[PDB]
Amino acid sequence: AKTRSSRAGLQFPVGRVHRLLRKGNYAERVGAGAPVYLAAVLEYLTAEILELAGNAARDNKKTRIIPRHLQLAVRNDEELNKLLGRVTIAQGGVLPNIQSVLLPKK
Amino acid sequence: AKTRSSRAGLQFPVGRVHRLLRKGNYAERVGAGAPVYLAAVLEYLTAEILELAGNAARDNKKTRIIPRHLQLAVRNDEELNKLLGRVTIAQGGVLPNIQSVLLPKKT
Amino acid sequence: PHRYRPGTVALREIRRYQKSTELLIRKLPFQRLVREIAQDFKTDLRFQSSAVMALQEASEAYLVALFEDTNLCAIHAKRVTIMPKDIQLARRIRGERA
Amino acid sequence: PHRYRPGTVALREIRRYQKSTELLIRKLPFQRLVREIAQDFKTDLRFQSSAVMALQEASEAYLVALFEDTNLCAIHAKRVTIMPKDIQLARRIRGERA
Amino acid sequence: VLRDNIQGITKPAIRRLARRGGVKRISGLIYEETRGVLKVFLENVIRDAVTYTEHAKRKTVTAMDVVYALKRQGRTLYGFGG
Amino acid sequence: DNIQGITKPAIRRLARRGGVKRISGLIYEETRGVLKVFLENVIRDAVTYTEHAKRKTVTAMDVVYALKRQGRTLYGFGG
Amino acid sequence: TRKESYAIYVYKVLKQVHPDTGISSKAMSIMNSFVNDVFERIAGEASRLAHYNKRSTITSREIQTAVRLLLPGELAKHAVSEGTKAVTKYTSAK
Amino acid sequence: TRKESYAIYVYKVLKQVHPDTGISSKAMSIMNSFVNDVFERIAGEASRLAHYNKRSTITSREIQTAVRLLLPGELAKHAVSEGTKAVTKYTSAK
DNA sequence: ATCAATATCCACCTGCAGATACTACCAAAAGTGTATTTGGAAACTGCTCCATCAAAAGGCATGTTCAGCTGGAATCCAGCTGAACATGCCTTTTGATGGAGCAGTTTCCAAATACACTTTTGGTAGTATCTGCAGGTGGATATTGAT
DNA sequence: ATCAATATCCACCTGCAGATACTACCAAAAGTGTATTTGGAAACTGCTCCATCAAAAGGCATGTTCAGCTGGATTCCAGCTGAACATGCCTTTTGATGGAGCAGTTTCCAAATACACTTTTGGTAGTATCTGCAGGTGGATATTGAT
């Protein structure tokens, strides 16, 4: 017996997503393509964030992705930043930003 | 055979509210006490806004509550204003309000 | 000839428009704008009239509420004349463009 | 007798705290504040350590972002010194106020 | 052929809205500023409304699609079945 | 008092992370007051979820759910 | 084919609070959106509350907690009374 | 009692994207919250979509419209692409 | 203060869009009565983890002195923006017409629920070892600021 | 432009908190085969209502003139807020020791679901008749601004 994830060619657990859609009371029924589609959309977004967080980890001479790296990856990306606009990432800090009028007159 | 609303001493339809809770997929089961309670809350809230709107309709020498009256009654009430803080009542307009500094002369 | 001083009519107008609820943007012009923007998204669309009216009630309530916040930013700047920067400051704080 | 000019060290601090993520309010003092407030809704409550830490991370992130908005309102007013009215204006526009 | 209808949002109509918003004095650049702001607001709402329309396989935008689009944006509207 | 336990230096460090350079003396009391309204709102909700579950211990999850319905979603503490 | 609304019930309550006052259809439409909106928000809170507690049933209790979560201080205190009251009455009738 | 989490499937995706990069427990906890959050936002919108159209089934179509409604421009285009892809590849397999 | 040009208020009132009244029909809603199924309260309680307490360590907060420099008050003035006016466009409106397309009734099978069975798995636990990097030491070098 | 005082950066190092790893146990979970049921696409189409066209018209937009007064620029100085200390109060680490109570397991019964009928009702379609108030009219009061 081969798993549903393996068939759809995914890492995320298609069977779990299906089970979760059902026990969530989203609808009376849940077509079979739905947990596949959704599982892949979740994997992708995970890949997009881990890809950028990873770069951030590189740019900081580090190999281990920490909350800081996830915050920099999200706030420096226009789309991810919007999608997570009302979200607070614990121990993320903020982007280095100083209003120009506050800088020395030179 | 009385209606569940009369059994509860309510005007709002308990049978309907119980029915809507099921078709909205909120949980696998809906206890018979849920719609009774919820129908009471809806009625009370409806009563509260109608009370105030009816008064706003009197202050403007009107017999019929129109949308402006509902807006006046919600804006002028701190709590109904909080509960409907992200709501737009069509044809409601706004509350007469002019920032002080915009007024003429001094003293 | 009689002439009201600058600002008197503006105030007369505020009391006037704050007292009424009718829509302030012309009907048909607003309808062409909606059909233009929608068309640029999907050709061959039709609109229930109430759908157009719904958007006009939402847009105007949004603009009025926006001008209130804008007016407060101007007053904060010790002005009584709103400018693009005020609108921009309100939209930024509102998180419409943080 | 060395002495840095007003603003140089403050600016130096902005750069320092914007690079780190550690919480900035002392923990025990915060925990006390939390327990006191809750005591007002329900007596004899216990708090998971992770619960308190969740409140803190949420509160600081909230205050920090509010200072960003506040700072923009002070700057809007052509100042570099944030004041209560800047906080009020920011909260009012966010809808957390009026 | 629909072109430049954003200009249908006239200076007087924008002044009136400002008046209801409690505004006394308007700078000359506010009119273009407001048209730009309105257009973005309508693009976002119509985009969602039309998306609800297509999903239902209709060619007609209903008052409800609009009402549902508005609620997603946190602009709940009362009075149109919505 | 406790709210007064949130020291000036800490409110200053907070402002710094928020990019603030100069701070008026009235800010410290303003802030404390704002912080208290924030925590009362969030805790009021967490405790409500706590009582509903018939517990006497506020859990991280209770807080996270409170934050989510206040539109302040928080990642990292479960949920 | 059938289109339900709270019109007949809004109206009954209207005559209780204001015997000689009417309501325009446009205002009634708004009242109807209001009742639906609050209903959904309340059932939504309850729904989630139930799930957060691995409960598959939404009883008057979840409804009560939702109300406390959703309404401002004073509207909640009264809503809770009316509800508890309607449930107590209902319970002793059958 | 067991406590599920998306941690393992996250780590798997991590090593594909950055084979020589690790992730801290706290960062993993953040990624789990993220996956749970997007799942709920996505499922919830599909829910409403089905309801609005008087449908009792959430198909891959509702998940698609939900994704278009929820995600920003490009993120949306690609997610749709990945989505269609996995559903196609899944069908072309006994 | 006096006065005159206008806006504002309101009583009086007519026309009518919209609200109110009623009989009719009826399909979906809502209630009654059983038989059948089970969610979750209730009591007992093992184990996790929260509340405490000892308690130097010393870090970080507080009180103070000094003066740099920012905020707020005052002054001047170019020209932006409001008020009023003339002109006449185009939105609003009353109203009919075709027909697109939304929506109702129905026929019907691809697809989902419902189980029962078998098999695979990811989470909990230990037990033991491995390592990315926070944190400390130097020493170079840039930044800040007085001259 | 020079030059002392500090901060900031960096290359290197070591210890440990926490990430990695092999083994093992196991209940819940995921896949599979079979029987039964149904959601909702299809096809046909009744019928609502959207897009158009027509026309008369005056409400209202556009464009210009003009000057009141607001915003912008500039100057000025009182005093607040930052920097730098000297001081010492209490946050912080943490080790550990009761024990609260969260969470797992077993019961078992009020309450929910399923199911078959009967009675009730809100919504709708067809006409038909009131009524609150919008909007016009005329004239008395109130507001505003020049003198």
TrEMBL record, chain A:
<keyword id="KW-0007">Acetylation</keyword>
<keyword id="KW-0597">Phosphoprotein</keyword>
<dbReference type="GO" id="GO:0000786">
    <property type="term" value="C:nucleosome"/>
</dbReference>
<comment type="function">
    <text>Core component of nucleosome. Nucleosomes wrap and compact DNA into chromatin, limiting DNA accessibility to the cellular machineries which require DNA as a template. Histones thereby play a central role in transcription regulation, DNA repair, DNA replication and chromosomal stability. DNA accessibility is regulated via a complex set of post-translational modifications of histones, also called histone code, and nucleosome remodeling.</text>
</comment>
<dbReference type="GO" id="GO:0046982">
    <property type="term" value="F:protein heterodimerization activity"/>
</dbReference>
<dbReference type="GO" id="GO:0005634">
    <property type="term" value="C:nucleus"/>
</dbReference>
<comment type="subunit">
    <text>The nucleosome is a histone octamer containing two molecules each of H2A, H2B, H3 and H4 assembled in one H3-H4 heterotetramer and two H2A-H2B heterodimers. The octamer wraps approximately 147 bp of DNA.</text>
</comment>
<protein>
    <recommendedName>
        <fullName>Histone H2A</fullName>
    </recommendedName>
</protein>
<feature type="domain" description="Core Histone H2A/H2B/H3">
    <location>
        <begin position="1"/>
        <end position="75"/>
    </location>
</feature>
<keyword id="KW-0832">Ubl conjugation</keyword>
<keyword id="KW-1017">Isopeptide bond</keyword>
<feature type="domain" description="Histone H2A C-terminal">
    <location>
        <begin position="78"/>
        <end position="106"/>
    </location>
</feature>
<keyword id="KW-0158">Chromosome</keyword>
<dbReference type="GO" id="GO:0030527">
    <property type="term" value="F:structural constituent of chromatin"/>
</dbReference>
<keyword id="KW-0539">Nucleus</keyword>
<dbReference type="GO" id="GO:0031507">
    <property type="term" value="P:heterochromatin formation"/>
</dbReference>
<keyword id="KW-0544">Nucleosome core</keyword>
<dbReference type="GO" id="GO:0003677">
    <property type="term" value="F:DNA binding"/>
</dbReference>
<keyword id="KW-0238">DNA-binding</keyword>
<comment type="similarity">
    <text>Belongs to the histone H2A family.</text>
</comment>
